[PDB]
């Protein structure tokens, strides 16, 4: 509490309102100037990059960015404009410009104009509260720009100034004698929600009359398109409601018109809720400590975190298959010279994971900040006499250990289940022998087709149920190995691994057929013989989301489901009967019998072709029905996978793993039960320890629990990233086209570890992304310097280094070096910067898994 600690804590709560208000208004104005520049960065003369690409789908949907507009403009407004001083537009003049460049420049300028003015008006409230300020204090870096000192004594934002430099003439909100103004923060909740309702109404008027998207049901009967004037329902997506990439009319609320009708809906709701609160503001005793801005800061901030998580979820679904993003896949997208696989989905993934990441940070930081309010209360005596039940509901220390311990138990059980299943199935997929057990892989041999006429040597047991049976090789009467055709494989049969070409399982010798004539519930339309070893395909159904999704889809699609089932049925019967006819040919034994047989097969054949084409086309019609929750790349149903089931369990376990430190902040900011047995009392929110006593105590403060939340949460977050970008999370080494994935029509990019090496071969083909990869790795491992129990070693070595450098200064007569003292971070600041370095390392590196492309092929 003397070093660097007073720099990132210089602006703490509570604060006066004019100071919060003006500072927010200035940030708003600054964020509008930055978006201004992003509009300039989106014009059509620039390369694709990750900024202008995250904005383009939305700019298309608004009609600002026209995808099919090539005509160059040469005059538009004021007379004669080939190019000027910076030219016809400042510096945009050497370029050829279209209408969408002008729209983009118009919107960019507005943003910059309205931003700059919001910055000024915000400084009028901010500096105006203080009586006013000087150009030299506002800007502060003008003292050392000699000359300009006569215009750095001028006072701005003053109370009685001439109009153009006034600030707040009555000094503060509370003194100004306007009765409309509300005097507390509860009271003010009402005009705030009226103001927000009005911002909605503004966006809908702009949508309707400036962007020309009327609200449903007042949509136009026709729209203008690059091919002329077209009925709304046939005009393609940016212009009308017809989705080209799914080839269907869009629901009316799936369009930007749907969005302008919701503008008016939401606006009316917010205005009415504000009118209600104008007569009935919040009042209960449970809430009146929230007038302190330090306390509401906790409520608001972790609320916004939850809002951010909810944006991620809603946005993901709503837009995973929307024509805004798919339209990027036809725009010849080139980044750092390259050509991207599926840039639509990539950009979509980046926006949703960016919201996800904001959600975690703000929830955690809101809780941390709440822990600071509560520690304050304890350390001044008034925690024990808080009156709101939102504090007092959790004061009993024994309830606090019951809450925490059962959320550890729930975390434990569900993480053990998830991770334990991942481990079981990587054992299965890798065919590992443990001596005590042999893991066995999925393997499939087609049994219909022409592949069902391929022969195999088969070792057949007689009676698996008599231990001490044994088996024999299937043979001819002549003694030589009979080749069994795949159609005649039976359950129990063993085939040599090396007759199948398998070199990856050298520890066991045979594949066992465990199921014949198998057709995947969801998968390829074929019939198979299977070794299910240890691979647990049933685990897909251990997912409550498998069942809700499939039940609702069955209900919407019941009678094509039913006909597809009857087609499969008729086909399996035809296959079986055709296999018996083929077998009578094989074993016919005398050409009279062999002609009779071949003539029977020749007569059944047309009918077996009919049943196959029937099954094929019902199974194709079934696989093109609309998705509910689990989706294709073309918004079609897919069954849930082992991957989806693992992701369900990992969300429960891993978010509880990551959030148990936050419950420790909320309950144990002053005393945990380990502290309370010793009589200890944590004296501040950020101390590093108090140890070596009792074995050592590093990491009990609230600041540290915040850092341990951030780390532990890296684990569910990376589950989310792998799952968005198409990794397979249910094992560690899944290969892209392994027999299981191929037979069950699953597309994935890798499998835990394998994903990592699989995506990085794509990452290596971009030299900007490989530079990012190198820098990312270096930031991270340096966090270890700062996080290991080693600060004393670093202090005592730094000291040797300082002595030495001062010896060199004194010897060589170099005055700048005879008093060097190297600065060595203390333990608290080492933990802060260690968490910073750990976090940023990891998440630059994750950006790369998204930036490489979306390789899921659906």
């Amino acid at each position: 509490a003397n070093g660097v600690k007073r720099w990132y804590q210089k602006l703490e709560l509570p604060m006066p309102p004019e100071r919060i208000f003006g500072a927010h208004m200035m940030l708003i104005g600054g964020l509008a100037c930055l978006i201004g520049t992003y509009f300039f960065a989106s014009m059509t003369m620039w390369n694709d990059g990750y900024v202008n690409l995250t904005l383009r789908p939305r700019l298309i949907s608004l009609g600002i960015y026209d995808p099919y507009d090539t005509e160059q403009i040469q005059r538009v407004w004021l007379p004669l404009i080939g190019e000027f001083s910076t030219s016809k537009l400042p510096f945009f003049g050497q370029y050829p410009l279209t209408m969408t460049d002008f729209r983009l420049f118009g919107w960019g300028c507005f943003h910059i104009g309205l931003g700059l003015w919001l910055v000024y008006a915000g400084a009028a409230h901010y500096y105006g509260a203080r009586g006013g300020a000087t150009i030299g204090e506002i800007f502060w870096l003008l003292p050392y720009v000699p000359g300009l000192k006569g215009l750095c004594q001028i006072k701005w934002f003053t109370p009685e100034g001439p109009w153009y430099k006034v600030g707040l003439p009555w000094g503060s909100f509370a003194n100004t004698p306007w009765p409309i103004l509300r005097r507390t923060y509860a009271d003010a909740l009402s005009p705030h929600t009226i103001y927000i309702g009005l911002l909605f109404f503004i966006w809908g008027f702009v949508l309707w009359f400036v962007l020309d998207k009327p609200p449903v049901p007042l949509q136009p009967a026709q729209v203008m398109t690059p091919n002329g004037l077209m009925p709304l329902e046939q005009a393609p997506f940016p212009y009308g409601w017809f989705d080209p990439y799914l080839n269907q009319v869009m629901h009316p609320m799936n369009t930007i018109n749907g969005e302008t009708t919701m503008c008016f809906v939401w606006g009316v709701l917010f205005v009415a809720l504000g009118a209600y609160w104008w007569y009935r503001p919040p009042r209960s005793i449970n809430i009146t400590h929230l007038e302190d801005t330090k306390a509401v800061f906790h409520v608001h901030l972790t609320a916004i975190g939850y809002v951010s998580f909810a944006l991620a979820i809603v946005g993901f679904l709503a837009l995973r298959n929307h024509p805004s993003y798919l339209m990027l896949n036809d725009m010849n997208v080139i980044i750092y010279g390259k050509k991207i696989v599926n840039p639509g989905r990539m950009i979509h993934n980046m926006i949703t994971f960016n919201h996800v990441q904001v959600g975690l940070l703000y929830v955690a930081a809101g809780v941390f900040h709440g822990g600071q309010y509560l520690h304050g209360l304890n350390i001044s005596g008034a925690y024990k006499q808080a009156r709101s039940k939102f504090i007092t509901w959790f004061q009993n220390p024994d309830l606090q250990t019951k809450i925490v311990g059962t959320t550890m138990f729930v975390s434990f059980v569900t993480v053990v289940f998830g991770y334990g299943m991942i481990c079981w199935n990587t054992g299965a997929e890798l065919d590992l022998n443990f001596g005590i057990y042999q893991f066995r892989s999925f393997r499939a041999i087609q049994m219909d087709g022409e592949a069902g006429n391929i022969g195999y040597r088969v070792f057949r047991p007689k009676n698996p149920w008599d231990p001490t049976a044994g088996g024999d090789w299937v043979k001819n009467p002549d003694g030589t190995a009979k080749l069994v055709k795949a159609r005649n494989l039976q359950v129990g049969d063993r085939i040599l691994n090396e007759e199948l070409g398998i070199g990856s399982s050298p520890t066991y010798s045979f594949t066992t057929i465990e199921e014949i004539n198998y057709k995947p519930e969801w998968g390829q339309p074929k019939l198979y013989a299977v070794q299910w070893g240890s691979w647990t395909h049933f685990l897909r159904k251990v997912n409550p989301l498998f069942w809700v999704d499939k039940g609702i889809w069955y209900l919407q699609n019941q009678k094509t489901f039913e006909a597809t089932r009857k087609a499969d049925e008729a086909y399996l019967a035809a296959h079986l009967k055709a296999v018996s006819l083929l077998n009578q040919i094989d074993d016919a034994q005398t050409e009279e019998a062999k002609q009779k047989a071949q003539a029977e097969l020749d007569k059944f054949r047309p009918e077996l072709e009919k049943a196959h084409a029937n099954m094929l086309e019902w199974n194709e019609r079934l696989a093109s029905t609309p998705a509910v929750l689990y989706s294709n790349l073309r918004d079609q149903h897919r069954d849930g996978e082992i991957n989806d089931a693992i992701f369900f369990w990992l969300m429960i376990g891993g978010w509880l793993f990551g959030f148990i430190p936050l419950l420790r902040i909320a309950f144990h900011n002053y005393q945990s039960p380990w502290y309370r047995d010793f009589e200890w009392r944590k004296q501040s929110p950020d101390f590093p320890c108090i140890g070596p006593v009792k074995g050592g105590t590093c990491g009990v403060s609230i600041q540290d629990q915040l850092w341990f939340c951030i780390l532990f949460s890296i684990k569910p977050l990376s589950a989310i990233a792998w799952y968005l970008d198409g990794g397979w999370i249910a094992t560690m080494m899944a290969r892209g086209n392994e027999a299981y994935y191929l037979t069950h029509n699953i597309s994935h990019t890798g499998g835990v570890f394998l994903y990592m090496w699989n995506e990085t071969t794509w990452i290596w083909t971009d030299n900007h992304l490989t530079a990012m990869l190198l820098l990312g790795h270096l930031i991270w491992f340096v966090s270890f310097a700062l996080w290991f129990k080693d600060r004393g070693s670093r202090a005592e070595g730094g000291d040797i280094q300082s002595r030495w450098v001062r010896l060199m200064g004194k010897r060589l007569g170099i005055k700048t070096l005879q008093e060097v003292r190297f600065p060595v971070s203390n333990l608290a600041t080492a933990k802060l910067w260690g968490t910073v370095f750990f976090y940023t390392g990891t998440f630059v590196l994750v950006f790369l898994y998204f930036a490489d492309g979306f390789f899921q092929n659906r």
Binding site: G30, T44, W46, P67, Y68, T70, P226, N332, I334, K338
Partner: protein
């Protein structure tokens, strides 16, 4: 603040035709594929009778220049429609197995470098942006199965 925009540079495109942005054309599928079809066919003849006079003559000037550098058109090895020639081993772009087992990024370098014996290198004939357009046109030849 940081990305004040983002300084990514200006986009490389093809040749300019007066009054119609070439940079823009290079991201608008119907414009880029019209130029890909011209390169692919070696003529402006299969272009929509709706094509403007200026367009039809800019393409011809493009071809005439390429004819002096001994450029060989893609059609007629591969045909006007795909799926080349088994005789010459010329690739069939209509085939779905050929299409699934190629990425568009990968396809690029096989046109740049040429491919084994007969398919010629185009690195000294065409710009990398004109190869990108052709990879996009070849994509639209795919048939099912």
């Amino acid at each position: 603040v940081m990305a004040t925009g983002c300084f990514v540079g200006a986009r490389n495109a093809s040749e300019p035709r007066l009054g119609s942005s070439s940079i823009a054309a290079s991201r608008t599928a119907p414009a880029y594929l019209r130029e890909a079809q011209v390169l692919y066919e070696g003529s402006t003849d299969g272009l929509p009778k709706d094509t403007p006079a200026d367009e039809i003559a800019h393409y011809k000037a493009m071809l005439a220049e390429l004819q002096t550098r001994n450029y060989a058109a893609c059609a007629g090895c591969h045909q006007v429609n795909g799926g080349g020639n088994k005789a010459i081993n010329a690739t069939n772009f209509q085939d779905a197995g050929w299409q699934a087992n190629n990425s568009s990024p990968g396809m690029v370098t096989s046109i740049v470098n040429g491919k084994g014996k007969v398919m010629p290198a185009y690195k000294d004939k065409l710009t990398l942006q004109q190869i990108n357009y052709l990879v996009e046109y070849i994509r639209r030849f795919e048939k099912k199965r």
